[PDB]
Design a protein around this ligand. Structure first.
Ligand SMILES: Nc1nc2c(ncn2[C@@H]2O[C@H](COP(=O)(O)OP(=O)(O)OP(=O)(O)O)[C@@H](O)[C@H]2O)c(=O)[nH]1
Ligand SMILES: Nc1nc2c(ncn2[C@@H]2O[C@H](COP(=O)(O)OP(=O)(O)OP(=O)(O)O)[C@@H](O)[C@H]2O)c(=O)[nH]1
Ligand SMILES: Nc1ncnc2c1ncn2[C@@H]1O[C@H](COP(=O)(O)OP(=O)(O)OP(=O)(O)O)[C@@H](O)[C@H]1O
Ligand SMILES: Nc1ncnc2c1ncn2[C@@H]1O[C@H](COP(=O)(O)OP(=O)(O)OP(=O)(O)O)[C@@H](O)[C@H]1O
Ligand SMILES: [Mg+2]
Ligand SMILES: [Mg+2]
Ligand SMILES: [Zn+2]
Lengths: 346, 347
DNA sequence: ATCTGTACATGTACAGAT
DNA sequence: ATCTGTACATGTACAGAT
DNA sequence: ATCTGTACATGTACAGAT
DNA sequence: ATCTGTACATGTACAGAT
């Protein structure tokens, strides 16, 4: 039933190989250009993030997210309108981009560089997608076997302690524990040029922390290892991502929703239900169902807090209209009470 | 439990911890500073705190501290000393030339210089009453005897640090896969390994750093013994077993061949056999201690206790401990066990 | 002026003291 | 239950070195 | 500063066993 | 049907060499 859906969603080994060798060629070349030139971004390092590198990509290997992170010292941070997630950054290579380090100016140069290197690539069919305003990504479209998108995300790396707004976030104490949380919070934090001073605004990223959690998700150390037993936590994430993707293809009414909403929700569930035995593979139906119910509670209450930044409600009225949330509840309730017809279509 | 009251006696006092640590840290820091002067041969050596006090299983007074002075030693090839598994020769104006004899890094020559340096710095200390203990042959330690309120021993252990992959003899060791898991084991084995001085050119592997990690990360659940987790009694069992041996050892010289490392090794095997946190519930302290005793007894009677890291090395081989010694220790453990542990009442 | 090995600054788990 | 000393990891300031 | 080599985790594929 | 064992594939950390 749901096993058969996961069978459909499973990536093929062949497709993984072909997509990765092409993706890696392009990425490596872009990364070399950023450094083996006296560009402003000399020093950037690659950080592979998001679903393909977390092993929760579904359907096909057609979307890759790579952070190019740049270490930069000092960095005074000023919280933007108590959003929790948005900041202005303050004071060398980066002179060209300011009082205040302008996200847009810096992203613009990053983008320009990337576009130029892409023009110089003759051995692969690869263009740069038209820019989405306010978006932190430079997005590459590759062809050949298949359509493949690659999001190149510029990121500031700071080694200071995480901003105050995150103090009460990452509530993993009863699940992964205090030692894990203390150590995760000793890692650097990241700032991505998302923008709401809207053009100078940056947004926090915890993509690195999320990756660690996806690959270290059990209360037992052996969860999902070769001498442990297999959770169905990841499988539930896949099923929920797929239900939203399918609904999103059909209804433009759901444009404001994205996979990060589902990722966030399941982090909350994984915290609510820390035991590995509450995610037994034999209870895949119940587990999926309790996740659906939780997401619906989030929709009904108009409340889904950033897992890392609790004051930031991703389902605030300001970000998603009530109407949209009620529409999505209708559609989830329906699939749920009719055996998920939408899992059968293409 | 009678055993809760024993642990109450064994519990270290914060006051005593403070006083001992203030002095120990002063001495160690000064010894460590001196090691990085006048281009001594040990310049670069770094401090690694290890053993029971740093693992929080020191019992009944904070009077013995173990600190490794470890020195990164890059290009080195190892030759196993007669298939022992644990003993090696080390080979390559390098600083350590002064201890070489035909490509072979002499343990005793290097330890001798280390020792000499330490003795000199100790003479220069006027703050505190501290002498250097007479050398025990084949011991890797330079041992300091301090007296502030009371007697405190500090073992300064010279150590070579290699960053290569661990020696072959350890491949099947550290069998933590069903307990702490494969990711933990892979990562542990990416840490360096250590060589300490044990004929006179022979060195011995140390895993004191790995043992410390395991003692402080000992559960199958990540929250074992944490503030939002459940308490286990693994460390309490280790303390009771250490205490039974200590008490027996101070009364009977027949037990000179036994040491606390035997009980640490045994309990690592038990922790592997019984991985679940629920098999070390605080409420089941008696059973848990008792099963540990029974296992140790089987080790004694069958003359088999393998090094946790080096499986082919039997710490209870006939060549290391006479049968008579092992039978003597079994009778004494059997006795304590069947008569209410009277030795826990002593002194 | 700039650079750096050493020591301090900050944060918290662990476990003893209350 | 809460408070508190030691150990330990990482970040950052700086007298002395360059 | 940059690159390879090694080791093993996380995957997918499929036969034979259950 | 599911599980177990082997084979084949990629990603990732870090040592040692350059
Ligand atoms: N690794 C990583 N990728 C990110 C991050 N933020 C955004 N991205 C990528 O950038 C893409 C677009 O970012 P969004 O935040 O959706 O930005 P947008 O399209 O301007 O705006 P929305 O309509 O708000 O989605 C995402 O789909 C990811 O590929 C981040 O913090 N880390
Ligand atoms: N941290 C640490 N300390 C060690 C190590 N090996 C020995 N020591 C310390 O040095 C002391 C002496 O080591 P032993 O192996 O007992 O040497 P010995 O007593 O001469 O020899 P035995 O007769 O085999 O006991 C130990 O009790 C510890 O205090 C090691 O690998 N790491
Ligand atoms: N609004 C957001 N706030 C914070 N981080 C975000 C946000 N959107 C995306 N991210 C981060 O960027 C990564 C890439 O986002 P993306 O939208 O590609 O999804 P994904 O997690 O890779 O899943 P999929 O690509 O299959 O939909 C996420 O995994 C997450 O770490
Ligand atoms: N024979 C040995 N082989 C290998 N490592 C050993 C050996 N003896 C001791 N060690 C290591 O040296 C450390 C210090 O040894 P020591 O004899 O002080 O015991 P301990 O573990 O500190 O317990 P305690 O000192 O309270 O009896 C041990 O923790 C262990 O890591
Ligand atoms: Mg993605
Ligand atoms: Mg000791
Ligand atoms: Zn525990």
């Amino acid at each position: 039933k749901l096993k058969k859906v996961l069978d459909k969603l499973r990536l093929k080994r062949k497709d993984i190989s072909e997509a990765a060798e092409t993706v890696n060629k392009v990425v490596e070349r872009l990364l070399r250009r950023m450094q083996k030139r006296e560009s402003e971004f000399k020093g950037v390092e690659q950080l592979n993030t998001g679903s393909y590198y977390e092993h929760v990509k579904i359907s096909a290997p057609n979307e890759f997210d790579v952070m190019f992170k740049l270490e930069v010292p000092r960095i005074e941070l000023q919280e933007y309108y108590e959003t929790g997630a948005f900041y202005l950054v303050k004071f060398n290579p980066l002179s060209h981009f300011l009082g205040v380090l302008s996200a847009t100016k810096m992203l613009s140069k990053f983008r320009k560089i990337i576009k130029e290197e892409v023009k110089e690539i003759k051995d692969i069919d690869v263009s740069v997608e038209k820019e989405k305003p306010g978006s932190p990504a430079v997005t590459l479209l590759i062809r050949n076997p298949e359509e493949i998108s690659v999001n190149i995300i510029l990121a500031l790396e700071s080694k200071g302690s995480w901003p105050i707004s995150t103090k009460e976030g990452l509530p993993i104490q009863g699940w992964l524990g205090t030692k894990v949380r203390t150590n995760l919070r000793r890692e650097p934090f990241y700032l991505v040029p998302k923008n709401a001073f809207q053009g100078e605004t940056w947004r926090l990223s915890f993509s690195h922390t999320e990756k660690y959690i996806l690959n270290n998700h059990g209360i037992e150390k052996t969860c999902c290892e070769s001498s442990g037993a297999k959770c169905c936590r990841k499988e539930c994430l896949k099923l929920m991502k797929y239900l939203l993707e399918q609904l999103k293809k059909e209804f433009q009414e759901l444009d404001a929703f994205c996979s990060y909403h589902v990722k966030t929700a399941i982090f909350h569930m994984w915290t609510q239900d820390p035991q590995d035995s509450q995610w037994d593979p034999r209870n895949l139906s119940s587990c999926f169902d309790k996740l659906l119910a939780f997401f619906l509670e989030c929709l009904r209450t108009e409340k889904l807090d950033h897992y890392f930044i609790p004051k930031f409600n991703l389902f605030s009225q300001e970000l998603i209209d009530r109407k949209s949330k009620e529409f999505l509840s209708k559609k989830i309730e329906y699939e749920r009470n009719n055996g998920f017809p939408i899992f059968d279509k293409l």
